Design a protein around this ligand. Structure first.
Ligand code: 3PE
Ligand code: 3PE
Ligand code: 3PE
Ligand code: 3PE
Ligand code: 3PE
Ligand code: 3PE
Ligand code: 3PE
Ligand code: 3PE
Ligand code: LFA
Lengths: 504, 606
């Protein structure tokens, strides 16, 4: 019922942001703020009225809310939305990060701010639609639809200090990676639909109907490979990862584009919701390759993050390492590891949002991102280095932050399933501490290594400090009291895990 | 006793207030907040101890909430308090309070007063969480918080990159230890289904009746975590470098909180180690080897604080030796007495550093018993307690209990190692004391903690007995003749070591300079000065290949491997554009070529 409005309020709000720029240059930011506040309020209302903590696992499908409308009846294609605990958590995180992205671009008084806000709102609506769609064609449609405003944002509103051609190159690489992988996913979807049609006679794209599809072993492996190639591009999984540091480097300086779609993790959700239930035997056969790719992703991302002289690229490779952890968790077939993966995705979203906002404000103060040109910035700034220290402490997995809860439940469940991959991943946590300490030492400690770092810098704004402290409070509360989040996603995770292990 | 969570809440409130004050408050107000938070924690600890002894030493449990619950995975946020927890809590709160008053006097006029006190308050709160936790994951929270606060406090003078490098080395080595501890946690939850200490001890003998190998793995990983935190073999290299921070930081790390966590971890999970006797013997062997190496390293250090660091490593090795010979009460008693006299020694060394205006090595000093008589007296009683001087120091009684437990359990080689280590301890301690405080001169908020730690370093500290009955098993008693001759041997060894140090360094250094200038003497001094080359080995085995692989990977080779199809596409497009030369006759020729190709293909496939 409210799910179409959860998708449509961002799109209508973006249209109103574009259109209401004639009334003033400071008007579209209020429209975007009202839009994302309304979307977040609707998501929280769905959380309160859903009763997710009392819901028990009854088997796939089990939706707390559902909407259906015919879209292309010739192919059996519907606007088909459904929400349960995992989808609801991802939608709430999307709404919160959208509010943060609106507030992070509050001071931009550019002549085309309305189109910027329209692109931001359309990216957020596409991400929410990805989390809500249980029609395969609609899921693919949102998956590819949220990449065009992101392309234009990176290419036209991006990092202004860099050349234009670097921004167009990064946006083009991101678009080609994501859309080619999406096309491979479309081929997998089409072949699954055709197998179901030849076995049943019904034109359907409904994920509930495609769950019970009789497939040969090898056909299922290829369909799983197409789905995994799309999700592995957008997770990222090595070696399909370099688009993410290039896109983070050339994103706009505020960081709203970083929070909008580059940081929300739809691929792990797609692996949990689609890859494991549709192809459980193929996923079980693919599990050693997937967890070894996760191990390689953890260590490669950590080593790449250590080798960066750019702080933004360091945070991007930090995301790569964390996603390697989540990818290991997804293929274990363990309830504890899946709940840890959910906590880890939410904690990564919050901590990377804090890191990217603080990096954007550091670049605002000092007009550079090379860590060799800064140093000793603890004595020069009022709030920024301490909050950066908190968020770097969070991303290495300190207890008291949600990252520890996530990665440690992941490692507990994984050790219950696969011990060697678990011990190698914990040494990956040692690597994580190494790169976080290296970033903190290179940026804020020591002596000033240039002239701009040796001067006093203006303090942060009250709104900027307010949302950074909101992220700090949310991360600490997730670290100390993760039980509401665990209870919200318990039934959906249980359904996915029971489907995965009861059909293998 | 219901105020057991206040001992964490008060240091947490102090840390939050002093962090968000950001140095805008006065130094008096910041000192009041920090020192009063730790003092109120100590007062609540005193009331808790009074209630504990009034209730007949009953184990008290205070749940607060459930940390996480996923099916059978149930981790609670519950504090527990028995005799061991009360002993560690009282030691941490009282010694941290005394160090906090000394830091309130000491850190006056320094940048980052509020930051220093916030970090020390968070350190106190993390160690209270560590010692009060009833399950391994909450203890892991306290463990990692203690490591993080150690990193924050060691590199407190952040402008010098050497302090920062020491802080990162300490954090990385201890993080390796915490990964070993995490392995122990994973094994124990996978086997027993719980991480509560009492429940694990209850369920382990029934679960491991057929096979015991995974319990040996769990106890070995617990030992790895313990030696990571307590700076023992093979994760001991961080302590000497990490001593680059301020003096109260070193007193807090070496006496109260940081290095006692491994001893507390082995003592708390003592039942699981009792079911794996080979791992417990390995704990004893690791302690003996570490104390011998630390004594030999401290023999040749030219720095006061480096000698104190390696002495801390030696005393923690003594505690590990006591744990390995199943003398648990001796280990905890030595932990508390060593906390007393090591805190006293570190505060006295800080007084020396402030009086000398710059951190000199020991050979640039001399005749300091006339400029600072009270500091010399504090150093003398702290070194007498460190050297286990008989009948007037608490360290003598603690080391006597450790050696009696080692001898009574049939561990003769560990007792011999302990005696040799005691001789070397007296040797290096009074070597440093006689070099610094004897020779020819060249160049209320702090007297009270020094006086209290002075009194506690004497036999008055040995008058305090930790209430470990009913928590740790009683050590097997030694015969009166054997106990008497062992006490006589320990006193004789300590006195002979002090006399040899007086013969070697108190007068003119002629035979010492003859030994050091010799080529075997120079070789051994260079070897032991670098702590037997373990830092060099870990640099050549872990640090340099990490840096080399980072340098090799800094261009992202997988990104270029995935960029290869774009290069192939560009090259193929450029090659294919050669056919568009604009010549009409070539276009006709290509039409006829395509006709030939199509017709030949059709006749081939027909
Ligand atoms: C450049 C990027 C894109 C990659 C290239 C494009 C896609 C290439 C796909 C190659 C597929 C090769 C199939 C080879 C065997 C064909 C014959 C066969 O075994 O047919 C069996 C079956 C027909 O018999 P039936 O009675 O329908 O049995 C139902 C079985 N489930 O057949 C069926 O039921 C249909 C089987 C369809 C199999 C799935 C095809 C698409 C899978 C996703 C994309 C490919 C894998 C991922 C990408 C690879 C690397 C790029
Ligand atoms: C301009 C030049 C540059 C640009 C162009 C570059 C090249 C583009 C095209 C590349 C892809 C080529 C086609 C790949 C798919 C081949 C499929 C195939 O050979 O299928 C055979 C068989 C079909 O299954 P079958 O045995 O018939 O099942 C019925 C009874 N079991 O299959 C099976 O039985 C299962 C086979 C599984 C393994 C084959 C697929 C490998 C996919 C490689 C990529 C993904 C690797 C894994 C993930 C990595 C991280 C994402
Ligand atoms: C011992 C027996 C049992 C084995 C247990 C496991 C190994 C224990 C190793 C303990 C010693 C580790 C020492 C690490 C020191 C790190 C601190 C340091 O030296 O920092 C210096 C440098 C600073 O870097 P930066 O921030 O850029 O500073 C700017 C200018 N200096 O920082 C750097 O250059 C970064 C250094 C990174 C070091 C990474 C170490 C990774 C350890 C992985 C252990 C794997 C164990 C298993 C191995 C395989 C076994 C089959
Ligand atoms: C690790 C240190 C020691 C622990 C205390 C401080 C922890 C960190 C503080 C910040 C985060 C706190 C998050 C949790 C707060 C308490 C809420 C809670 O858990 O309520 C649950 C419980 C009632 O529900 P119950 O059923 O008993 O719980 C099991 C789950 N169903 O509730 C109860 O039974 C009542 C529990 C009351 C606890 C009050 C704690 C006050 C702490 C003030 C700290 C001030 C500084 C904060 C920042 C510190 C640095 C991060
Ligand atoms: C829990 C018991 C113990 C168990 C183990 C716990 C281990 C994990 C603990 C995680 C918490 C974060 C640890 C690291 C925080 C470091 C912050 C810091 O350095 O603060 C000091 C700084 C003031 O220092 P100063 O240099 O004087 O000022 C800057 C220059 N003008 O301060 C500032 O500049 C302002 C404040 C910056 C951020 C302070 C810390 C924020 C996180 C904790 C509080 C969160 C909010 C409280 C409520 C939570 C929800 C209930
Ligand atoms: C003071 C005391 C110090 C003690 C130090 C002892 C030496 C260091 C030991 C480190 C590892 C300890 C692991 C202990 C727990 C093992 C638990 C376990 O289950 O062991 C068995 C397991 C194999 O299990 P499996 O054969 O599958 O069957 C079991 C059930 N079916 O086997 C295993 O799990 C063993 C796995 C060993 C892995 C070694 C190689 C990895 C080393 C680090 C790699 C990561 C860092 C390098 C970078 C990699 C980049 C790709
Ligand atoms: C890779 C290099 C790492 C760093 C260097 C490590 C050096 C290790 C040196 C000791 C050798 C290993 C430990 C002893 C051998 C293995 C255990 C053994 O065989 O023990 C036999 C015996 C005790 O047997 P028992 O009491 O009957 O045991 C019943 C309980 N299960 O007897 C013992 O257990 C004797 C133990 C004595 C205490 C150890 C230290 C003194 C002896 C070695 C001297 C040299 C050590 C290095 C230099 C130190 C400074 C001089
Ligand atoms: C059953 C066993 C019973 C007990 C047996 C004996 C146990 C060990 C006793 C060692 C101490 C003996 C006391 C006399 C020597 C030490 C004091 C000394 O003379 O130190 C001199 C010098 C350091 O003096 P310093 O103040 O730095 O120099 C000022 C002038 N530049 O120092 C130096 O430069 C180095 C002096 C070396 C003295 C000889 C050390 C012999 C022991 C070496 C053990 C090596 C490890 C074990 C074997 C490993 C394999 C080879
Ligand atoms: C998807 C966004 C998630 C943000 C992080 C949320 C973390 C959980 C916070 C829960 C609230 C903790 C503090 C209040 C405890 C109330 C206890 C209620 C039962 C008595």
């Amino acid at each position: 019922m409210l799910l179409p409005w959860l998708i449509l309020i961002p799109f209508i709000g973006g249209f109103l942001c574009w259109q209401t720029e004639r009334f003033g240059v400071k008007v579209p930011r209020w429209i975007a703020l009202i839009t994302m506040g309304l979307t977040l309020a609707l998501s929280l209302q769905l959380w309160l009225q859903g009763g997710y903590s009392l819901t028990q696992s009854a088997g796939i499908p089990q939706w707390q809310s559902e909407f259906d409308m015919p879209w292309i009846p010739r192919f059996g294609i519907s606007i088909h939305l459904a929400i349960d605990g995992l989808s609801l958590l991802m939608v709430v995180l999307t709404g919160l990060l959208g509010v943060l992205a609106v507030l992070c671009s509050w001071k931009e008084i550019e002549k085309y701010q309305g189109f910027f806000h329209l692109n931001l709102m359309w990216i957020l609506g596409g991400v929410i639609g990805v989390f809500l769609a249980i029609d395969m064609f609609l899921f693919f449609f949102f998956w590819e639809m949220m990449l065009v405003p992101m392309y234009f944002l990176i290419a036209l509103w991006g990092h202004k200090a860099s050349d234009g051609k670097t921004r167009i190159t990064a946006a083009t690489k991101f678009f080609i990676y994501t859309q080619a992988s999406g096309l491979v996913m479309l081929i997998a979807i089409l072949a699954l639909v055709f197998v179901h049609y030849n076995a049943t006679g019904v034109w359907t794209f409904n994920y509930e109907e495609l769950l019970n599809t009789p497939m040969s072993s090898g056909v299922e492996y290829l369909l799983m490979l197409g789905f995994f190639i799309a999700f592995a591009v957008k997770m990222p999984v090595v070696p399909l990862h370099g688009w993410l540091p290039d896109a983070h480097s050339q994103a706009p300086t505020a960081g709203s584009v970083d929070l909008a779609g580059i940081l929300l993790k739809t691929a792990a959700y797609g692996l949990l919701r689609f890859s494991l239930p549709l192809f459980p035997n193929a996923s079980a056969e693919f599990a050693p390759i997937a967890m070894w790719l996760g191990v390689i992703g953890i260590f490669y991302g950590a080593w790449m993050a250590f080798a960066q002289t750019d702080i933004k690229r360091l945070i991007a490779y930090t995301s790569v390492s964390h996603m390697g952890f989540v990818l290991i968790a997804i293929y274990t077939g363990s309830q504890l590891a899946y709940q840890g993966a959910v906590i880890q995705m939410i904690a990564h979203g919050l901590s990377a949002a804090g890191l990217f906002i603080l990096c954007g404000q550091l670049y605002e103060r000092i007009h550079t991102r090379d860590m060799r040109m800064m140093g000793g910035l603890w004595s020069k700034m009022k709030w920024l280095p301490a909050l950066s220290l908190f968020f770097a402490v969070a991303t290495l997995g300190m207890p008291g932050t949600g990252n520890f809860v996530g990665e440690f439940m992941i490692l507990f469940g994984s050790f219950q399933v696969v011990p060697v991959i678990t011990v190698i991943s914990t040494f990956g946590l040692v690597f994580a501490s190494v790169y976080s300490l290296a970033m903190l030492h290179r940026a804020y400690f020591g002596k000033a290594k240039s002239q701009i770092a040796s001067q006093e810098l203006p303090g942060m704004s009250l709104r900027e400090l307010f949302m950074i402290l909101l992220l700090v409070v949310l991360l600490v509360l997730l670290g100390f009291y993760p039980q509401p989040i665990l209870d919200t996603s318990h039934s959906a995770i249980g359904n996915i895990q029971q489907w995965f292990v009861n059909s293998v | 006793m219901n105020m057991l969570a206040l001992t964490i809440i008060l240091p947490l409130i102090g840390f939050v207030l002093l962090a968000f004050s950001r140095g805008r408050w006065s130094e008096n107000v910041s000192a009041i907040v920090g020192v009063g938070s730790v003092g109120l924690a100590a007062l609540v600890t005193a009331f808790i101890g009074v209630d504990f002894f009034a209730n007949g030493e009953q184990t008290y449990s205070q749940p607060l909430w459930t940390w996480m619950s996923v099916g059978d995975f149930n981790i609670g946020f519950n504090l527990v308090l028995d005799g061991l927890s009360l002993t560690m809590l009282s030691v941490v709160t009282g010694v941290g309070f005394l160090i906090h008053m000394y830091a309130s006097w000491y850190m006056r006029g320094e940048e980052g007063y509020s930051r220093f006190f916030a970090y020390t308050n968070l350190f106190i709160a993390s160690m209270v969480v560590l010692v009060l936790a009833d399950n391994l994951l909450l203890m892991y929270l306290g463990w990692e918080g203690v490591g993080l606060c150690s990193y924050l406090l060691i590199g407190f003078y952040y402008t010098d990159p050497k302090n920062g490098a020491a802080a990162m080395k300490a954090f990385v080595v201890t993080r390796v230890g915490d990964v070993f501890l995490a392995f122990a946690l994973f094994i124990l939850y996978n086997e027993l289904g719980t991480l509560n200490f009492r429940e694990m001890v209850e369920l382990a003998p029934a679960h491991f009746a057929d096979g015991n190998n995974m319990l040996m793995w769990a106890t070995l990983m617990l030992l790895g975590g313990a030696v990571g935190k307590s700076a023992q073999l093979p994760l001991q290299t961080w302590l000497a470098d990490a001593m680059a921070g301020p003096t109260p930081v070193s007193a807090l790390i070496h006496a109260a909180t940081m290095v006692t966590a491994g001893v507390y971890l082995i003592a708390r999970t003592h039942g699981l180690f009792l079911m794996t006797p080979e791992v417990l013997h390995l704990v004893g062997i690791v302690g003996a080897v570490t104390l011998l190496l630390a004594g030999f390293a401290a023999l040749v250090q030219t720095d006061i604080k480096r000698v104190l660091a390696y002495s801390t490593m030696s005393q923690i090795g003594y505690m590990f030796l006591a744990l390995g010979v199943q003398a648990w009460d001796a280990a905890i008693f030595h932990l508390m007495t060593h906390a007393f006299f090591k805190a006293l020694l570190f505060l006295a060394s800080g007084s020396v550093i402030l009086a000398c205006h710059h951190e000199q090595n020991i050979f640039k000093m001399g005749g300091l018993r006339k400029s600072i008589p009270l500091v010399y007296l504090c150093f003398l009683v702290g070194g007498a307690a460190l050297s286990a001087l008989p009948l007037v120091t608490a360290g003598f009684f603690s080391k006597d209990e450790i050696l009696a437990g080692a001898m009574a359990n049939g561990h003769i080689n560990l007792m011999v190692a302990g005696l040799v280590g005691a001789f070397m301890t007296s040797l290096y301690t009074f070597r440093m004391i006689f070099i610094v405080f004897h020779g020819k001169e060249q160049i209320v908020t702090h007297s009270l903690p020094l006086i209290v730690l002075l009194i506690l370093s004497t036999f008055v500290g040995a008058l305090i007995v930790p209430p470990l009955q009913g928590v740790l098993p009683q050590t097997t008693e030694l015969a009166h003749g054997s106990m008497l001759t062992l006490e006589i041997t320990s006193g004789v060894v300590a006195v002979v070591g002090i006399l040899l140090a007086a013969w070697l360094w108190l007068g003119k250094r002629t035979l010492v300079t003859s030994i050091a200038n010799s080529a075997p003497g120079r070789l051994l001094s260079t070897w032991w000065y670098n702590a037997w080359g373990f830092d060099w080995l870990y640099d050549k085995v872990f640090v340099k290949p990490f840096l080399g692989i980072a340098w090799l990977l800094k261009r992202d080779p997988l990104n270029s491997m995935m960029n290869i199809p774009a290069v192939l596409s560009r090259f193929a497009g450029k090659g294919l554009l050669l056919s568009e030369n604009g010549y009409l006759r070539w276009y006709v020729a290509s039409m006829s070529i395509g006709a030939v190709v199509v017709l030949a293909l059709l006749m081939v496939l027909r």
